[PDB]
Chains A and B, each alone.
Chain A
């Protein structure tokens, strides 16, 4: 989140909003996985 690029279709900051740390998860197979999503503006039910 160094900056939202001036041309919005190419701004990577938007997708990092609210993301302050990731979570890692390692399985028995020896495959490591990392991700996180954060979002507050919502309502009781979602289309997705």
Chain B
């Protein structure tokens, strides 16, 4: 169950990050739309009802995921810096 739980955790983290990028869709429109379909054949390396008997294949898929999604992170990182640093040192707004 431990491996199965981690499998779902990775899926949740990926889907969650994507939804967070979606809120910033005007910032990374090109990346989000294109990468969705680029990452679909990557996810297909760890199907539902997964058993880790060829786990190295998924490891390769995750390695590419991290290397290909990065342009999205870079553009959003810029936006976040501007949006957070705009906060005039208000601990309340900063935390939120």
Mark A residues whose CB is within 8 Å of B.
Answer: 2, 5, 7, 9-10, 12, 15-16
Give the number of A-B contacts (CB < 8 Å).
18
Nearest neighbor of A3 in chain B, beta-carbon distance:
B23
Nearest neighbor of B24 in chain A, beta-carbon distance:
A12
Cβ A12 vs Cβ B96 within 8 A? no
Classify chain B: how many residues form its interface, as a range: 10 to 19
Minimum C-beta distance from B60 to chain A (A):
34
Cβ B25 vs Cβ A7 within 8 A? no
Cβ A16 vs Cβ B86 within 8 A? no
- Chain B, residues 10-42, CB within 8 Å of chain A (1/0): the string is 000000000000011111000000000000000
